[PDB]
Design a protein around this ligand. Structure first.
Ligand SMILES: *[C@@H]1O[C@H](CO)[C@@H](O[C@@H]2O[C@H](CO)[C@@H](O[C@@H]3O[C@H](CO[C@H]4O[C@H](CO)[C@@H](O)[C@H](O[C@H]5O[C@H](CO)[C@@H](O)[C@H](O)[C@@H]5O)[C@@H]4O)[C@@H](O)[C@H](O[C@H]4O[C@H](CO)[C@@H](O)[C@H](O)[C@@H]4O)[C@@H]3O)[C@H](O)[C@H]2NC(C)=O)[C@H](O)[C@H]1NC(C)=O
Ligand SMILES: *[C@@H]1O[C@H](CO)[C@@H](O[C@@H]2O[C@H](CO)[C@@H](O[C@@H]3O[C@H](CO[C@H]4O[C@H](CO)[C@@H](O)[C@H](O)[C@@H]4O)[C@@H](O)[C@H](O[C@H]4O[C@H](CO)[C@@H](O)[C@H](O)[C@@H]4O)[C@@H]3O)[C@H](O)[C@H]2NC(C)=O)[C@H](O)[C@H]1NC(C)=O
Ligand SMILES: *[C@@H]1O[C@H](CO)[C@@H](O[C@@H]2O[C@H](CO)[C@@H](O[C@@H]3O[C@H](CO)[C@@H](O)[C@H](O[C@H]4O[C@H](CO)[C@@H](O)[C@H](O)[C@@H]4O)[C@@H]3O)[C@H](O)[C@H]2NC(C)=O)[C@H](O)[C@H]1NC(C)=O
Ligand SMILES: *[C@@H]1O[C@H](CO)[C@@H](O[C@@H]2O[C@H](CO)[C@@H](O[C@@H]3O[C@H](CO)[C@@H](O)[C@H](O[C@H]4O[C@H](CO)[C@@H](O)[C@H](O)[C@@H]4O)[C@@H]3O)[C@H](O)[C@H]2NC(C)=O)[C@H](O)[C@H]1NC(C)=O
Ligand SMILES: *[C@@H]1O[C@H](CO)[C@@H](O[C@@H]2O[C@H](CO)[C@@H](O[C@@H]3O[C@H](CO)[C@@H](O)[C@H](O[C@H]4O[C@H](CO)[C@@H](O)[C@H](O)[C@@H]4O)[C@@H]3O)[C@H](O)[C@H]2NC(C)=O)[C@H](O)[C@H]1NC(C)=O
Ligand SMILES: *[C@@H]1O[C@H](CO)[C@@H](O[C@@H]2O[C@H](CO)[C@@H](O[C@@H]3O[C@H](CO)[C@@H](O)[C@H](O)[C@@H]3O)[C@H](O)[C@H]2NC(C)=O)[C@H](O)[C@H]1NC(C)=O
Ligand SMILES: *[C@@H]1O[C@H](CO)[C@@H](O[C@@H]2O[C@H](CO)[C@@H](O[C@@H]3O[C@H](CO)[C@@H](O)[C@H](O)[C@@H]3O)[C@H](O)[C@H]2NC(C)=O)[C@H](O)[C@H]1NC(C)=O
Ligand SMILES: *[C@@H]1O[C@H](CO)[C@@H](O[C@@H]2O[C@H](CO)[C@@H](O[C@@H]3O[C@H](CO)[C@@H](O)[C@H](O)[C@@H]3O)[C@H](O)[C@H]2NC(C)=O)[C@H](O)[C@H]1NC(C)=O
Ligand SMILES: *[C@@H]1O[C@H](CO)[C@@H](O[C@@H]2O[C@H](CO)[C@@H](O[C@@H]3O[C@H](CO)[C@@H](O)[C@H](O)[C@@H]3O)[C@H](O)[C@H]2NC(C)=O)[C@H](O)[C@H]1NC(C)=O
Ligand SMILES: *[C@@H]1O[C@H](CO)[C@@H](O[C@@H]2O[C@H](CO)[C@@H](O)[C@H](O)[C@H]2NC(C)=O)[C@H](O)[C@H]1NC(C)=O
Ligand SMILES: *[C@@H]1O[C@H](CO)[C@@H](O[C@@H]2O[C@H](CO)[C@@H](O)[C@H](O)[C@H]2NC(C)=O)[C@H](O)[C@H]1NC(C)=O
Ligand SMILES: *[C@@H]1O[C@H](CO)[C@@H](O[C@@H]2O[C@H](CO)[C@@H](O)[C@H](O)[C@H]2NC(C)=O)[C@H](O)[C@H]1NC(C)=O
Ligand SMILES: *[C@@H]1O[C@H](CO)[C@@H](O)[C@H](O)[C@H]1NC(C)=O
Ligand SMILES: *[C@@H]1O[C@H](CO)[C@@H](O)[C@H](O)[C@H]1NC(C)=O
Ligand SMILES: *[C@@H]1O[C@H](CO)[C@@H](O)[C@H](O)[C@H]1NC(C)=O
Ligand SMILES: *[C@@H]1O[C@H](CO)[C@@H](O)[C@H](O)[C@H]1NC(C)=O
Ligand SMILES: *[C@@H]1O[C@H](CO)[C@@H](O)[C@H](O)[C@H]1NC(C)=O
Ligand SMILES: *[C@@H]1O[C@H](CO)[C@@H](O)[C@H](O)[C@H]1NC(C)=O
Ligand SMILES: *[C@@H]1O[C@H](CO)[C@@H](O)[C@H](O)[C@H]1NC(C)=O
Ligand SMILES: *[C@@H]1O[C@H](CO)[C@@H](O)[C@H](O)[C@H]1NC(C)=O
Lengths: 453, 134, 134, 134, 48, 38, 49
């Protein structure tokens, strides 16, 4: 009466993990910065992003078991190494540096830490050697015991200088699905991250994502929809971080005020090392400004979303970081070429009544700068940041946070949300939470009435 | 109604059967141009789009060993089993999706491929050779 | 007459129709042997011969979603439009080349592929399913 | 009888004809997963499994230019030549292997492919176009 | 045997100055130089 | 400023010696079209 | 250049003992200074010039 019939091209997908693409964003030819982050290899964006909503579809998503984050994590790391591979190595810089405090310690109650270091560097030729100067900056040894110094970068890994022609300005990079696969995009405004998404669409290329390396504060990220989201792999478990997404962007302004200069001293037959010249003009510490009214409102809006999990009419606190690694304890990021390591202790002194908290036009944040970074998970290399000739000022949107809860028996008392970070994958889950990769299986069987021959 | 690519993922199997050529045309050629010569990042995406046609031709091979070979709707000569989906007609094609269908058949689907590759063309072809000389 | 590969590029479309299997047999397999293991120069030519079968299977997919599926001459059920090439028969097949034909159709060719993928197998298959139970 | 993959390599050509879909299903998809990203050792095996589908589609192309196109047993309209294998029926299919058959035809096999690609579809198709208007 | 087949009745418009074959051989020769000099002997200590 | 000298090759770029085993005699190289093209 | 020494235990030189307590000026962490280390050892070696 009825026989099996195959149907080729049925909308049937099974969740799997495979290699994805990357997009060029199409302005890459007019950038002409020779090499941005992924302008090297990515293909241009389609003229129209095929965003098709799938009616009557509820798909179960899980941002914490996603494999797209592992791909972008392994793409960024392989992006770092291939970018620093052909650049200038600085292994002969591991010498002894007789340094000196900067000439302006004015009022030593305030701090001044730049070391007018001079050292015997190798030169163009191999026969002679010349003495140069002006490496500077807080990161350094104390020596073994004008005081001698050396590099503690040399105490861990080899050093290579970043190519001065490339840039660190993030180009919008949205991953793309290859042939035969599809990317499912959640679309409801409120999304737990873990659970079924009742409004699902499908695309090949995702929406533009800027690869931003930042700690304690997510920068230039995608805004939430109408409400502040508090996502976590496990809220009850303390060790798991608490990713936050903002509804309103928190304005932040960072400045490197030292009108700086550079020196291109010649080393070797082809290489050339860029040294931080003498600071022209006055000196003061780099900083970042956040408007106090917007941050007060943002905290007053996040605290209510946090009470939904931890109690209506209860008090929560958050102090500064606990301690440990410099990249973990400080809001570390990049801008223009310099790597700001700001301390956010001036932002997290708060206790919260059920209606209020317990002028000042803005809140300023002290910020130190670092040029040699051992952020690479391969501890066999380190990067030297070239100096930026001039003054640096960069604005940004603050969209996220990374918090850790103080463990123990703090139920009847209050909870504390100290800032944290470390794992780069947490910086990506705030942008790939709404995306899942599925493979197409178009072979289906169904019974209908028909007969052959 | 069209509704584009995968538009009938939650519709009925009869309504989704009206969008077979749309899901097919967009799975094979998602052509990325790789004229630029970038060393190590091509081998990952090129391996992806080579495994794409390896998975594609595996379905065409299964769609070739069966009496079905047109890349369309197609009928066979293997009877439906009452143990598979104890349901009448129009209970399926007007109140079921292809996902929920593949879910209920996933228990019994592995033998159906064998019943389509042996019960037919190991015998249908043999009968075609032993019934065409006259 | 044969005249080898692409020998009838300037002949009539009826005379060039007599050399279809020659142009087909030499486009797919221009087999270069890559037994030697040379690092960076293989990924450029291997990407070329992988995009070759990606472009090949795209045509087979278009030659599969249509009622036409034999890799030969084939007829459809979509009528010719007088707006496309306002010419009678034998004015084409005895005084026109395939290049000049594709040039005049290039204005109207993009909709013909849609008229062959929807006006037929979205309906011809549906009619085949609704006309075979008797 | 099945006897698995290549089980009838020494049996009769009639008994081995009962195991066509077994040798076919295991030649195309010997799928190795290459999710790990290892630099230089992938390009050798990926080139191997790309030349695999290049050799596969070359056979499908020869199995497409001929009147035969179903990936099964298939008949043509080219007559057998008494100069090729001066043997009667059932002397072949019950006392010969496919290897020994290909060995005796290897002297005369190269022209048979030409007799199947020109003597038919250069003329059979042309006759199909000149016999369907009525 | 080089398959050289003349195409009768064919006039094709050529332009040697917009050709992309020259760009390929240019990029092949340069990549040929670097890969040939890559594993050879470096002489950086000769800068004395 | 026997007179001193140095390399002005060193005044621009690094130096590497050509392998003595390889040669620079040009072998006839004719480009070939892949499958599907002409 | 490695100024070496036979191992301290050649006991009964009819039986063989060939490990060379070599010491040499190796480069160090830094490029300015250099440190002297020791103990490369083993039979494979030059005899010197
Ligand atoms: C971390 O969290 C901490 C605590 O929550 C925050 O630290 C606190 O910052 C504030 C703001 O700077 C500090 O406030 C102090 O304010 C006084 C000025 O106010 C006092 O004196 C006024 C006159 O001079 C007086 O009017 C005030 O009110 C009195 O009079 C009114 C009249 O009506 C009456 O109604 C009141 O009842 C009072 O009688 C008031 O007395 C200022 O002088 C302080 O600075 C000086 O002194 C401190 C210590 O003596 C010294 O450290 C400074 O260098 C300076 O010399 C100070 O600004 C408050 O003291 C801070 N708390 C602590 C513990 O230091 C902090 O901001 C959060 N973040 C960070 C980054 O730490
Ligand atoms: C988050 O997103 C914000 C965007 O708001 C980013 O902030 C921008 O960062 C970039 C990169 O640091 C800044 O661009 C730089 O501006 C410098 C000053 O240029 C002035 O003059 C030009 C020309 O008229 C103006 O367009 C510009 O607005 C300034 O008035 C330039 O000197 C820099 O040059 C760089 O690119 C050139 C290109 O040729 C190179 O030659 C140089 O070597 C160098 O690489 C650069 O253009 C920009 O001003 C910032 N502000 C914006 C756009 O609002 C954040 O960086 C980003 N990330 C984070 C972590 O916050
Ligand atoms: C960090 O430390 C460095 C040293 O490593 C320091 O650079 C030195 O600055 C001093 C500033 O006085 C320079 O000294 C003078 O520089 C001028 C050029 O501006 C020369 O003309 C001078 O020479 C004249 O006067 C001499 C006095 O006897 C005469 O002998 C001579 O013939 C000339 O007439 C004099 O050299 C010094 O040269 C530099 N060092 C180098 C290598 O250039 C730097 O300023 C310090 N920075 C800070 C912020 O502390
Ligand atoms: C979070 O906030 C807390 C405060 O609520 C903060 O704790 C403070 O940290 C600072 C350092 O950032 C401490 O200040 C130091 O204290 C020691 C003694 O405890 C002094 O010896 C230090 O001075 C030395 O270094 C100076 C540099 O020039 C020298 O001039 C001087 O001679 C000394 O060698 C320095 O004053 C401070 O004691 C603590 N404690 C408090 C409560 O203030 C904490 O660091 C913040 N961050 C984290 C990660 O918790
Ligand atoms: C292979 O050769 C190496 C040398 O390259 C040799 O290593 C040396 O061993 C001797 C053994 O005596 C060491 O000498 C002593 O080491 C002790 C530590 O165990 C020190 O405390 C001694 O110094 C004290 O006594 C000195 C005597 O004047 C005092 O001046 C001094 O202040 C201390 O009180 C003394 O150095 C020697 O140090 C090492 N060499 C090094 C670099 O460590 C090794 O043993 C040889 N191996 C074999 C198997 O032959
Ligand atoms: C850079 O290079 C210069 C010269 O190459 C170094 O100067 C050297 O400094 C040391 C330490 O004072 C001198 O050693 C001393 O030598 C005298 C005799 O000249 C001796 O009596 C002392 O006991 C001491 O050993 C050394 O002579 C001197 N070199 C020269 C050629 O004068 C300098 O230290 C190097 N480093 C830096 C950071 O400048
Ligand atoms: C070579 O590098 C290592 C790190 O790879 C250096 O270890 C350093 O050890 C010091 C010891 O004080 C660490 O200081 C820390 O300070 C905090 C308070 O700020 C305190 O709570 C800790 O217990 C610890 O004392 C320091 O973080 C650590 N790392 C660095 C980068 O300095 C080692 O000192 C280096 N070798 C030499 C000779 O300097
Ligand atoms: C961030 O937001 C909080 C909550 O709105 C602000 O708290 C408010 O602070 C002001 C002045 O600091 C308080 O006014 C004063 O209160 C004291 C209480 O004893 C009273 O004696 C004074 O006469 C004066 O009224 C206010 O009560 C307090 N709460 C609210 C709900 O407004 C905080 O100031 C904000 N921080 C900023 C704006 O920088
Ligand atoms: C490792 O390095 C040390 C020191 O850098 C080397 O010691 C050097 O040994 C040579 C050979 O005896 C000394 O040369 C002699 O110098 C005196 C004057 O000091 C001269 O009168 C002699 O005619 C002879 O040329 C050299 O001075 C000495 N270096 C120092 C700084 O004392 C040692 O040879 C190196 N190699 C090993 C394997 O230890
Ligand atoms: C630089 O910092 C040093 C301390 O590291 C300051 O030196 C001291 O300054 C005080 C002034 O109250 C003097 O009484 C001390 O004698 C100084 N120390 C020494 C060792 O001389 C110095 O003032 C700071 N600024 C400058 C311009 O050098
Ligand atoms: C960060 O910098 C921007 C631009 O310099 C500031 O925006 C200006 O804010 C002032 C004061 O409200 C206005 O008068 C200007 O019209 C604003 N300019 C623009 C272009 O918007 C912003 O206020 C700064 N934020 C902080 C926290 O310092
Ligand atoms: C190490 O080997 C040496 C020979 O290379 C031995 O040295 C000789 O030992 C004999 C003992 O019969 C002495 O008479 C010689 O005078 C030694 N030669 C020298 C140059 O002194 C030595 O005994 C071996 N063992 C030790 C512990 O050194
Ligand atoms: C000067 O440099 C020394 C290095 O030992 C440092 O300890 C001291 O704090 C500095 N003094 C300043 C910056 O006033
Ligand atoms: C979170 O951790 C707690 C404590 O280990 C555990 O009881 C709970 O089941 C965990 N929840 C999830 C979803 O992992
Ligand atoms: C607790 O819930 C009530 C009603 O849902 C809500 O109005 C209140 O804001 C919540 N708690 C707090 C203090 O936000
Ligand atoms: C908050 O304000 C409401 C309304 O005035 C009041 O009922 C409630 O008790 C207040 N809670 C606190 C903690 O002050
Ligand atoms: C910050 O967000 C606002 C709101 O849309 C936007 O206009 C602005 O361009 C954003 N700036 C950055 C750097 O993303
Ligand atoms: C249905 O399946 C069962 C078990 O797989 C089998 O025993 C039975 O013979 C099948 N019946 C038909 C009609 O295929
Ligand atoms: C011919 O094409 C025109 C415009 O594309 C269209 O309006 C007309 O209906 C077509 N006629 C036929 C017979 O296809
Ligand atoms: C058989 O082959 C021979 C030589 O190849 C040829 O001359 C003869 O015409 C062929 N006969 C048939 C019937 O094909």
């Amino acid at each position: 009466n009825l026989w099996v019939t195959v149907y080729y091209g049925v909308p049937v997908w099974k969740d799997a993990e495979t290699t994805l693409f990357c997009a060029s964003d199409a302005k890459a030819y007019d950038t002409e910065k020779h090499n941005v982050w992924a302008t090297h290899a990515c293909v241009p964006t389609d003229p129209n992003p095929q965003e098709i909503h799938l009616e009557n579809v509820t798909e179960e998503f899980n941002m914490w078991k996603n494999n797209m984050v592992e791909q972008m994590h392994t793409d960024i790391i392989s992006l770092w190494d291939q970018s620093l591979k052909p650049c200038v190595k600085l292994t002969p810089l591991c010498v002894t540096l007789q340094c000196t405090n900067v000439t302006n310690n004015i009022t030593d109650d305030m701090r001044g830490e730049l070391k007018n270091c001079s050292f015997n560097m190798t030169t163009e030729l191999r026969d002679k050697k010349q003495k140069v100067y002006s490496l500077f900056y807080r990161l350094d040894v104390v020596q073994i015991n004008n005081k001698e110094y050396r590099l503690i970068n040399c105490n861990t890994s080899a050093i290579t200088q970043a190519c001065p022609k490339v840039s660190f300005e993030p180009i919008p990079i949205h991953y793309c699905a290859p042939a035969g696969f599809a990317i499912l995009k959640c679309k409801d405004k409120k999304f737990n991250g873990t659970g079924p998404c009742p409004s699902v669409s499908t695309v090949q290329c995702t929406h533009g994502i800027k690869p931003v390396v930042s700690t304690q504060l997510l920068l230039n990220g995608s805004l939430a929809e109408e409400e502040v989201m508090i996502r976590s792999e496990n809220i009850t478990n303390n060790a798991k971080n608490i990713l936050v997404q903002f509804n309103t962007p928190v304005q932040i302004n960072c400045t490197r005020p030292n009108n700086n200069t550079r020196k291109s001293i010649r080393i070797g037959p082809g290489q050339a090392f860029y040294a931080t010249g003498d600071i022209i003009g006055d000196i003061r510490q780099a900083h970042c400004n956040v408007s106090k009214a917007t941050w007060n409102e943002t905290l007053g809006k996040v605290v209510k979303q946090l009470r939904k999990h931890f109690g209506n009419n209860t008090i929560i606190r958050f102090a500064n970081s606990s301690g440990g690694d410099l990249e973990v304890t400080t809001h570390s990021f990049n801008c223009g070429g310099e790597f700001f390591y700001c301390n956010t202790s001036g932002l997290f002194n708060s206790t919260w009544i059920s209606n209020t908290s317990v002028s000042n036009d803005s809140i300023t944040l002290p910020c130190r700068i670092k040029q040699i970074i051992n952020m690479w998970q391969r501890i066999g290399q380190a990067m030297y940041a070239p100096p930026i000739q001039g003054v640096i000022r960069c604005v940004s949107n603050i969209t996220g946070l990374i918090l850790t809860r103080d463990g123990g028996s703090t139920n009847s008392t209050t909870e504390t949300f100290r800032p944290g970070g470390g794992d780069m994958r947490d910086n990506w889950r705030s942008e790939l939470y709404k995306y899942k990769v599925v493979k197409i299986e178009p072979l289906g069987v169904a019974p209908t009435r028909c007969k052959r021959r | 109604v069209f509704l584009g690519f995968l538009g009938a993922a939650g519709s009925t199997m009869g309504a989704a059967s009206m969008t077979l050529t749309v899901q097919a045309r967009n799975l094979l050629s998602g052509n990325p141009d790789w004229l630029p010569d970038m060393t190590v990042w091509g081998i990952k995406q090129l391996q992806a789009r080579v495994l794409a046609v390896e998975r594609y031709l595996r379905d065409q091979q299964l769609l070739g060993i069966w009496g079905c070979s047109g890349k369309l709707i197609c009928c066979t000569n293997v009877p439906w089993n009452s143990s598979w989906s104890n349901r009448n007609l129009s209970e399926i094609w007007d109140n079921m999706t292809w996902l929920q269908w593949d879910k209920e058949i996933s228990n019994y689907t592995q033998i159906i491929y064998g019943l389509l590759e042996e019960s037919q063309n190991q015998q249908e072809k043999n009968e075609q050779d032993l019934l065409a000389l006259d």
